[model samples]
Each structure stands twice: as structure tokens, then as C-alpha cells.
Target: RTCQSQSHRFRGPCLRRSNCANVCRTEGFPGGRCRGFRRRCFCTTHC
Candidate 1:
């Protein structure tokens, strides 16, 4: 399993999954995706 969390740097709708992943990388996460009705970016990484 992996740890997940909402991005502190990404506040807008993450239409581009690639963009969100890059944003998450800066946050030290391995990857990320858009989630929620608000379309926020959520990061993922090994626990």
C-alpha cells in the first residue's frame, strides 16, 4: 500500500494528470492524480 495526501502546492483543478504528478514530485511524492468534485491534486508514495 501507499500513502496519499492532498497537495499543498496544487490548489486548482488538475486536468492534466502529468502536471499533478510533477507537482507531487516537488512535494517529494512519487506520483499524483486529480480527485474530488473540486478536482484537487492528491499525491501518492510508498509508506
Candidate 2:
């Protein structure tokens, strides 16, 4: 009867208007790791 949370988490950078540069290595965006080119996607629940 009630189930709608889906905690929204959006790590920025990777290419959001420069400045961000590489969002640090480029991963989860919180002093993490995922360097090499550029790629980090996530939106909604299974899409």
C-alpha cells in the first residue's frame, strides 16, 4: 500500500560544464576511482 522511496543519489562531474574537470578520477564522485576516458551513468530504478 506504501512503497516509494528510491533514494536518489547523483554524483556529479565527468563533464557537467567543465570546472568539475574529472570529478576526481571519475567514478562515484566522492573521492573515488573510475578513471580512463569517461563514463558514469545511472537514473531511476532499472532503466
Candidate 3:
């Protein structure tokens, strides 16, 4: 996927929905901010 240095940096494979109970559609998510909690894959990284 496309990686941005600043804006849109969090846009990656939208695999799961309930990833860490946080909003996967939000920025700075699915990263270390989840505190070791992350959901499994729901889709492929074809993006």
C-alpha cells in the first residue's frame, strides 16, 4: 500500500473491523498504539 510520511500514514490493509476494539478506519491505529491488542486478518492486502 501507499505510505505517507505525515498525512494518510495509517492507510493500510483493512483486514479486520474490531482490531483491538479500536476504529480501524481511524488514523494511527493497528499500530503500537493498540498496546499489543490486534484483531486477525479479514481480508487481503491487495490495496
Candidate 4:
């Protein structure tokens, strides 16, 4: 399964990709990354 366009709680620029991934894990996602010029956090998992 694919979890697309999941927005992070971070309201500002995403400076730490690892930080995003950490939060994603709590959100049930196995991983995450920073994407786009806006620098948003996106989570991913297998469904």
C-alpha cells in the first residue's frame, strides 16, 4: 500500500528529515522524508 501526500505537523521549514521520520513512526508509518520546495514531511508504509 502507499501513503501519499501525508503532511507533517511541522508548520515551518523541515530542516531535519530524521525528525520527520521519527514522528512518522509514531503515526504508524515505517519511514518518512522531506519533499518539495515547501519542505514538507511525507510518511510511508506497506499496506
Candidate 5:
């Protein structure tokens, strides 16, 4: 299975993939990326 998380919802739009990745790394995710038509940030890890 895979674990997933979204970026800071109260903050700004997820425009920078690098920023999402950095935050995800600190949150224990291996990496993250901008996803969907709205460009949301999604962090991923193996569960």
C-alpha cells in the first residue's frame, strides 16, 4: 500500500514542486509532486 498527504492547505497554492518535496521529506515521505488540474501537492510513501 501507499501513504499519501497533501501540502499546507491554509497556505498558498502548490506551485513549486520542490517546496512540496522538501516539506514531504521532513514529514517522512520519500518525495512529493504537484498533482491534479488544480495543481495540488501530494506526498507519497510506501506503507
Candidate 6:
């Protein structure tokens, strides 16, 4: 199950997807990725 949630902490670019996942972990997500032209972080979970 791939559930998506916008990261509340990531407000910048994706220098590293690993870093995005790390931030998402704090927000209760298991993974994350950079998305959109604005480069917003979207958190993913096994929902």
C-alpha cells in the first residue's frame, strides 16, 4: 500500500531522496521522495 502525504518539514529541493525519507520518518512515514517543479517532499507509507 502506497500512501502519500506532503512532508510538513521539507520546504526545499531534493539534494538527496535519502534525506527526504529521514525527514519523513520524523513525521511518521517510512519513506519519501522529491516531487513537482517546486520540489516538494512527499512522504510515503505502507498504508
Per-residue lDDT of candidate 5, residues 1-47 (tens digit)? 87666766414556877778878787778987766456777787788
Local accuracy by lDDT, each model: 0.83, 0.30, 0.30, 0.69, 0.71, 0.77
Please name the candidate that would achieve the greatest lDDT relative to the true structure. Answer: 1
Give the per-residue Cα lDDT of candidate 2 at 23. Answer: 35
Tens-digit per-residue lDDT, 1-47, candidate 3 = 72312222323333433442243334443332222223232222122
Q: 1 or 2, which is superior by TM-score? A: 1
lDDT per residue (tens digit) for residues 13-39 in model 4:
557877777777878778877665778
Stretches of candidate 4 exceeding 4 Å from the true structure: none
Q: For candidate 3, which ten residues in a row score worst on lDDT? A: 32-41
* Residue 34 shift from truth in candidate 2, angstroms: 8.4
Query: What number of backbone clashes does candidate 6 have, counting pairs of residues 3 or more apart or in separate chains?
Result: 0
What local lDDT score does residue 27 receive in model 4, on the 0 to 100 scale?
A: 81
**Cα lDDT tens digits for candidate 2, 1-47:** 32222212325533452323233324323232223234332211221
Cα shift from native, residue 19, model 3 (Å): 3.0
10 residues in a row with least lDDT, candidate 2: 1-10
lDDT of 1 by residue, 9-45 (tens): 8856888887799899998889997666688888987
Evaluate residue 44 in candidate 2 and report its C-alpha lDDT on the 0 to 100 scale: 19
lDDT of 6 at 20: 86
lDDT of prediction 2: 0.30
Give the better candidate number (2 or 5) by TM-score: 5
Q: How many clashes (backbone N, Cα, C below 3 Å) per candidate?
A: 0, 0, 0, 1, 0, 0
TM-score of each: 0.76, 0.15, 0.17, 0.63, 0.63, 0.69
Q: Tell me each candidate's RMSD, in Å, in order.
A: 1.4, 11.2, 9.9, 2.1, 2.3, 1.7
